[PDB]
Design a protein around this ligand. Structure first.
Ligand SMILES: O=C(OCc1ccccc1)[C@H]1C[C@]2(CN1)C(=O)Nc1ccccc12
Ligand SMILES: [Zn+2]
Length: 394
């Protein structure tokens, strides 16, 4: 799928985006690739952080759905007017789709200064579309309207006055074998809403955290390209950081570093990678009592950032952080791996990325099988609110 190789760009820490066209004539927009949400939504009015935006009234193929939409996140919210239009991905498949589009008329802490994207492409399932699950997501429309197979795959590649440029590939409708090496291992999608999966064990430099495994998935574990960190439930974050602190303890950093709010630096090219431990997440296998591990390096979870005040140093931000809404395997995790979103077979594949950043002692790894007898169930069951219970689904 050569024409889709290297179709993503962005700034380190600010999202990976793909070029899309909406409307007739086609308006080009840079759109964030987000597997943690299910709306297609584009800036449609002026904003300090947007160079440009979708102008509905200039598209001869726009239809207004006469209905508004509102999505709040933990960080960020937007709102706008729903409609449909013609949408294509120039460096994607050679098709054109009529899809739902949310035209964002207002927003708060959503757009990111300097990120260069003007909208979001939510690739997850209808169950978490807003206003509700009858708003068909983009990928569902693409599959229904064209012959494109029901899978996509992501290779996110990690990196003085601007942040580092990043690149990646979104292969729509298949798997490109040049983007990985070694075995591709699949974990089932637990439920089709998020890309929810189940972590059964976590190791830091070979050592088990030894928590009840439901903690790893409290209250869910999801794969989200639009989240930049590996985010971990509070209790798991405190244990993991305790173990990383212990391994690295020849270096005493500020509190702010471990809080993800402060760089630490070494003389150029002298970063002591080998004092930071590898982190291994064991994911449920397709077979009962089987799992496989994805192992990331500090080159994934320490993000490079060039200090203006000390440009001769190599500086890093800690990109593991605390969550109250479950584990999020964000770009930090994904930057180790080629990730196959096999919606057709209700599973997610991982293989070692041909573009992952490593050194001569260590590599990001995908390894299995590992076997447990009489395994626990590690899934958490979210409390059902009456609101959620009252919804009909016809
Ligand atoms: O996780 C996510 O949506 C949850 C969700 C909540 C509510 C409805 C459906 C899904 C998406 C959206 C995301 C990163 N991924 C984030 O939450 N804020 C933010 C800010 C800017 C860009 C991307 C994001
Ligand atoms: Zn009903």
């Amino acid at each position: 799928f050569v024409e889709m190789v290297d179709n993503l760009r962005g700034k380190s820490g600010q999202g990976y985006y793909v070029e899309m066209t909406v409307g007739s004539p086609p308006q080009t927009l840079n759109i964030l690739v987000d597997t943690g949400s299910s709306n297609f939504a584009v800036g449609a009015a002026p904003h300090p952080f947007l160079h440009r935006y979708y102008q509905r009234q200039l598209s001869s193929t726009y239809r207004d759905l006469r209905k508004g939409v509102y999505v709040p996140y933990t960080q960020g919210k937007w709102e706008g007017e729903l409609g449909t239009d013609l949408v294509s991905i120039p460096h994607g498949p050679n098709v054109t789709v009529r899809a739902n589009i949310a035209a964002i008329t207002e927003s708060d802490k959503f757009f990111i200064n300097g990120s260069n994207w003007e909208g979001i492409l939510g690739l997850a399932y209808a169950e978490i579309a807003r206003p509700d699950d009858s708003l068909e997501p983009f990928f569902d429309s693409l599959v229904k309207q064209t012959h494109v197979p029901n899978l996509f795959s992501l290779q996110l590649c990690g990196a003085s006055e601007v942040l580092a440029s990043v690149g990646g590939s979104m292969i729509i409708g298949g798997i490109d074998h040049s983007l990985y090496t070694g075995s591709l291992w699949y974990t089932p999608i637990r439920r089709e809403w998020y890309y929810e999966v189940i972590i059964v064990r976590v190791e830091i430099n070979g050592q088990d955290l030894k928590m009840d495994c439901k903690e790893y998935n409290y209250d869910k574990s999801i794969v989200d390209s639009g989240t930049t960190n590996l985010r971990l439930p509070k209790k798991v974050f405190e244990a993991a950081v305790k173990s990383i602190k212990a391994a690295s303890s020849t270096e005493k950093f500020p509190d702010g570093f471990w809080l993800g709010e402060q760089l630490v630096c070494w003389q150029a090219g002298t970063t002591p990678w080998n004092i930071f431990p590898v982190i291994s997440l064991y994911l449920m296998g397709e077979v009962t009592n089987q799992s496989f591990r994805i192992t990331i390096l500090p080159q994934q979870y320490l993000r490079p950032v060039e200090d203006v005040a000390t440009s001769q140093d190599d500086c890093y931000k800690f990109a593991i952080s605390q969550s109250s809404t479950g584990t999020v395997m964000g770009a930090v995790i994904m930057e180790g791996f080629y990730v196959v979103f096999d919606r057709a077979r209700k599973r997610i594949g991982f293989a070692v990325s041909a573009c992952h950043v490593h050194d001569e002692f260590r590599t990001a790894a995908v390894e299995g099988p590992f076997v447990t007898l009489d395994m626990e169930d590690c899934g958490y069951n979210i409390p059902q609110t009456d609101e959620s219970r009252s919804h009909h689904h016809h």
